[PDB]
């Protein structure tokens, strides 16, 4: 009936999907034509968001759900079996996301109980889970990774490993992997008057002016900005407000165009003008 989230594969070859019928379908789009390939069923409740891991680790795809469990489906010659499962949270799991391929193969999941698990991968079918309790007050909805940024020796750098995240408390808390081993909330961002729906960490076009977008029940979209590296300054700026809720927000890769999904079943595109004010480039559909 109604799908929730669906994301294209890297190298634009597949297209995983999931709807409230608890079915994780992986289609294939060669030439523009859709063609199913498997219907990974396994959640006691509707699937929420879904994310493809980086081809550098073979072919992986994880899906979270209202069943409080998250699944990771590997692939070995067409063998789409699940190599690991994780039910570390008590309430539904609104979102998942993968850490930039350099940190390794880390997966971030925000539940509705107000927590956040982080599955790191080891040599074999093993997965450690550094968890964050009471991250948000009433639960969490969004989880986005901060772009992998590189900081005289034979070493792969230690990254700042940050990742933002909105929730039901209206706060968009940023986070960071403390040198010792656990994450801590580097900062809070309270600009929304109701539930934060989604939070997307725009990719850095090599540019140091890192941005982040958010949309919430109030129907406003903010593009929080940081003027320089290392200054704990996030100055929100209003994109627009619709009389209805905004459900999703995503960044287009090159221009940094924002796809604003929400309001009237309509989706909008925005590009920040040479003036600084954001505009609607067109109406989709």
């Amino acid at each position: 009936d109604m799908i929730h989230d669906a994301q294209m594969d890297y190298y634009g070859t597949r297209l995983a999907t999931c709807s409230s019928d608890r079915s994780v379908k992986i289609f294939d789009v060669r030439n523009g034509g859709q063609i199913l390939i498997a219907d990974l069923r396994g959640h006691e409740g509707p699937v929420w968001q879904v994310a493809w891991a980086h081809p550098m680790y073979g072919n992986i795809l994880a899906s979270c759900s209202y069943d409080r469990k998250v699944i990771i489906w590997r692939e070995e010659n067409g063998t789409w079996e699940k190599s690991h499962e994780h039910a570390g949270h008590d309430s539904s799991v609104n979102s998942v996301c993968w850490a930039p391929h350099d940190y390794g193969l880390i997966l971030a999941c925000g539940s509705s109980d107000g927590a956040i698990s982080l599955l790191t991968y080891t040599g074999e079918g093993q997965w450690e889970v550094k968890k964050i309790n009471n991250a948000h007050t009433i639960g969490c909805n969004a989880v986005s990774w901060a772009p992998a940024v590189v900081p005289p020796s034979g070493q792969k750098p230690n990254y700042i490993k940050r990742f933002a995240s909105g929730g039901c408390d209206n706060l968009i808390k940023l986070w960071k992997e403390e040198e010792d081993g656990q994450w801590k909330e580097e900062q809070k961002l309270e600009a929304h008057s109701d539930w934060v729906r989604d939070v997307a960490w725009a990719p850095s076009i090599g540019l140091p002016t890192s941005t982040i977008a958010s949309c919430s029940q109030d129907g406003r979209v903010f593009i929080w900005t940081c003027d320089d590296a290392s200054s704990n300054t996030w100055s929100p700026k209003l994109l627009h407000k619709f009389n209805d809720v905004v459900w999703h927000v995503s960044w287009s890769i090159t221009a940094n165009i924002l796809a604003v999904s929400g309001g009237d079943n309509k989706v909008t595109l925005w590009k920040e003008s040479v003036d600084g004010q954001w505009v609607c480039i067109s109406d989709v559909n």
Binding site: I3, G12, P55, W247, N285
Partner: protein, 423 residues
């Protein structure tokens, strides 16, 4: 028995039946939900509003590449442009002589492309004065062709020969303007017209000094005989009998040609000259040939005006802006900021990505100053579209752009690896 959870969860989740969604993907395509997909995933794509035919033919990209010298950057093996003999001129061939583009381009090619005199001459005060002029004619000679239909035809309309003469002047045609003068028994003009081309104060004053007298009672002569003496005075638009009135039916460009031919106030910069005209007259709002002049006119403030201009008008084609900055930057022609250049290089290199023109997109990426960004993009672009940049795009683009031996092998290996399981 199964609908109450959908209701409970739909509700225990602040979810209206209005919930929609959309997300861009790696290839730069967005997935809207429409009910038109086997699974309701309208994978629409992103429009490259970049419209200029030649961009889709190997030859241009291929040929325009030999126009450059690539060299790995100071902080990594990622290639960046060292030297580029790129001129507006280049582009002309691939366009058609009737389009406004050819004009906009042909124009720039005149205003900026570097005038190059043939035979080397000892005397430099001279060489500097020649090029000074070569560029002058070149430009007026152009406008003469742009106002050709306009005036030529406006001449068929007269029963006034004196007015006919003033018109021939307007086309910088002294020879015919003179012939007419003698043939109508209005010779004294053929004399002034003779002087017109030069700069002799005797005349200048003789003209103006007369003009002043002509405003006292005796006003028994043609607006045309007057308009003509006005062309001798020196400044015709800021005069005692001004021509500012012509804005009615003449092309602002018709007028401009005047200020550039007879409107010499003193010997100094053309750029500044052009600029003088702009002051008395405002130019067509969304006009590209117009804008381009302001850019030429505002000499040192070049980049400042540009910024100022682009902030108000969608009259300059992304690709142009870029080609401008670039041709101007690698010829010393003007003053352009690294931040602003790369700022507009992304712009273009993006449209080229939207288009699925990875080689053109990638190439334009090399004019990236920011070594981090360059590497940053290149690694990305290539890592995703290797197959596309291989076997037939001309068979080597990447070696041509001095791209990293390793990067190729790496990203290559990665996909073969990817396809490996899929099969």
């Amino acid at each position: 028995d199964e609908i109450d959870n959908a209701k409970l969860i739909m509700k225990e989740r602040r979810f209206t039946a209005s919930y929609t969604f959309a997300k861009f993907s790696t290839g730069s395509m967005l997935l809207t939900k429409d009910i038109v997909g086997k699974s309701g995933v309208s994978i629409k794509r992103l429009p490259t509003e970049l419209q200029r035919k030649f961009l889709f033919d190997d030859v241009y990209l291929d040929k325009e590449i030999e126009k450059v010298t690539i060299e790995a950057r100071k902080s990594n093996p990622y290639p960046q442009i060292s030297e580029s003999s790129l001129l507006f001129k280049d582009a002309l061939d691939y366009m058609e002589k009737t389009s406004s583009d050819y004009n906009l381009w042909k124009l720039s090619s005149i205003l900026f492309d570097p005038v190059s005199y043939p035979y080397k001459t000892d005397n430099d005060q001279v060489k500097m004065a020649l090029l000074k002029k070569e560029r002058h004619c070149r430009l007026t000679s152009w406008i003469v062709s742009q106002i050709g239909p306009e005036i030529e035809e406006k001449i068929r309309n007269s029963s006034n020969e004196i007015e006919q003469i003033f018109l021939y002047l307007l086309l910088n045609d002294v020879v015919r303007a003179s012939k007419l003068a003698i043939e109508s028994k209005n010779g004294h003009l053929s004399v002034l017209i003779s002087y017109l081309g030069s700069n002799d104060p005797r005349i200048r004053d003789l003209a103006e000094l007369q003009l002043q007298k002509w405003s006292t009672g005796g006003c028994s002569i043609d607006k045309n005989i007057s308009k003509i003496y006005k062309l001798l005075s020196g400044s015709p638009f800021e005069g005692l009998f001004s021509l500012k009135e012509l804005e009615s039916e003449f092309s602002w460009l018709c007028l401009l040609n005047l200020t550039l031919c007879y409107g010499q106030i003193d010997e100094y910069s053309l750029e500044s000259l052009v600029q003088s005209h702009l002051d008395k007259f405002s130019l067509p709002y969304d006009d590209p040939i117009g804008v381009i002049f302001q850019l030429y006119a505002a000499n040192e403030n070049t980049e400042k005006l540009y910024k100022e201009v682009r902030q108000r008008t969608n009259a300059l084609d992304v690709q142009f802006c870029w080609y401008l900055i670039q041709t101007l930057r690698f010829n010393g022609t003007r003053v352009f900021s690294k931040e602003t250049s790369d700022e507009a290089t992304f712009a273009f290199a993006a449209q080229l990505e939207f288009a699925q023109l990875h080689g053109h997109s990638l190439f334009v990426s090399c004019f990236l100053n920011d070594d981090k960004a360059a590497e940053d993009t290149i690694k990305r672009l290539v890592m995703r579209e290797i197959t596309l940049l291989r076997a037939s795009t001309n068979d080597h683009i990447l070696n041509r752009l001095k791209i990293p031996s390793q990067l190729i092998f790496n990203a290559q290996a990665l996909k073969d690896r990817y396809e490996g399981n899929y099969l």
